[PDB]
């Protein structure tokens, strides 16, 4: 994919200066996909989650705007993907050839995310623009407001990495674990607090029971 997206409440004059920073050093892959190394868990992930879906970012913003206790504005950041951005599936496949097992809840979450992970911090050079998101209290919809183009952006001819994440820890023994989610089955790593900042801290539910319901009866 060429371009991916994140939502943040930090305004463009700050993000275009600093970029996005990793929570920590935790390379564990299934802890990242399940949200356990993200903001609702150990909050030390060595990855930044991005999505290729613009519609998902509308859902992220609605989940924040819909809360009575949330104040402030939200921006969608458009990010050029390069060789440090990985899709999930090749690493899913590779880790399975190491004896790793992902249950149906985790596989379900991963394919819904349309997720590309950055193994490094995301530089302002990769951030092309910011689009303010406007919330309509009467409809609950989120629309595009003012766009701001990043003068520091570099239009390099890169694209996302089609291979496996490097230095992946060898998979741990399988265990059923909570999967943090918010909104319509959005991984918690897409929350604003799942990148390190210079912020409203969304709460998450366990996606497993919800997924179990739509898979059964």
């Amino acid at each position: 994919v060429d371009f991916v997206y994140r939502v943040d409440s930090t305004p463009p004059d700050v993000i275009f200066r600093d970029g996005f920073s990793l929570l920590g050093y935790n390379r564990n892959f299934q802890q990242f996909i399940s949200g356990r190394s993200c903001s609702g868990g150990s909050s030390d992930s060595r990855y930044i989650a991005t999505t290729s879906s613009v519609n998902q970012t509308y859902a992220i913003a609605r989940a924040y705007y819909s809360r009575s206790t949330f104040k402030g504005n939200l921006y969608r950041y458009q990010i050029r993907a390069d060789n440090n951005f990985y899709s999930l599936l090749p690493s899913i496949t590779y880790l399975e050839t190491q004896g790793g097992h992902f249950n149906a809840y985790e596989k379900t979450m991963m394919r819904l995310q349309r997720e590309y992970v950055s193994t490094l911090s995301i530089l302002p050079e990769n951030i092309q623009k910011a689009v303010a998101l406007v919330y309509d209290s009467a409809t609950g919809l989120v629309k595009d407001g003012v766009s701001t183009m990043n003068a520091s952006y570099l239009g390099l001819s890169t694209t996302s990495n089609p291979g496996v994440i490097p230095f992946l820890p060898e998979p741990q023994t399988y265990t059923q674990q909570r999967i943090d989610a918010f909104g319509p089955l959005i991984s918690s790593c897409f929350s604003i607090g799942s990148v390190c900042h210079s912020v409203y801290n969304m709460s998450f539910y366990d996606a497993r029971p919800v997924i179990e319901l739509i898979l059964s009866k």
């Binding site: 819909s66 009575s68 309509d136 209290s137 009467a138 409809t139 609950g140 919809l141 539910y205 029971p209 919800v210 319901l213 009866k217």
Partner: protein, 118 residues
């Protein structure tokens, strides 16, 4: 306009659930009940039930049951349509509710939920 759709409570969450089998009036019933909150606030009208072989509308027991279970899981904002003074069993009324569950619809904002209004 729509009969039995005149009374509702909007933008609530289902925060409690009850499913049981019970003998009432010489008949073997199933019932379920939902409990409601309004965010962090408790509300007075916060329970309503559905019985499989009693009430104004006996149909839809399984579908309403699973629908209640779903919104209890998601915690999502919903509007509950209910009818008052239905259940006659005085032990059931005091244990649960005298209200019959009519319909459940979602709320896409603090202002709007699907379904008819006054």
């Amino acid at each position: 306009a729509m009969a039995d759709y005149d009374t509702y409570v909007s933008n609530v969450q289902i925060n409690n659930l009850s499913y049981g089998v019970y003998t009432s009036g010489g008949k073997e019933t199933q019932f379920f009940c939902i409990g409601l909150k309004h965010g962090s606030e408790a509300i007075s009208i916060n329970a309503m039930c559905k019985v499989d072989v009693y009430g104004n509308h006996k149909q839809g027991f399984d579908n309403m049951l699973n629908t209640a279970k779903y919104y209890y899981t998601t915690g999502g904002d919903v509007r509950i349509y209910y009818k008052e003074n239905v259940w006659r069993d005085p032990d059931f009324k005091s244990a649960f509710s005298s209200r019959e569950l009519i319909a459940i619809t979602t709320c896409s904002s603090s202002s709007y939920c699907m379904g008819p209004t006054v």
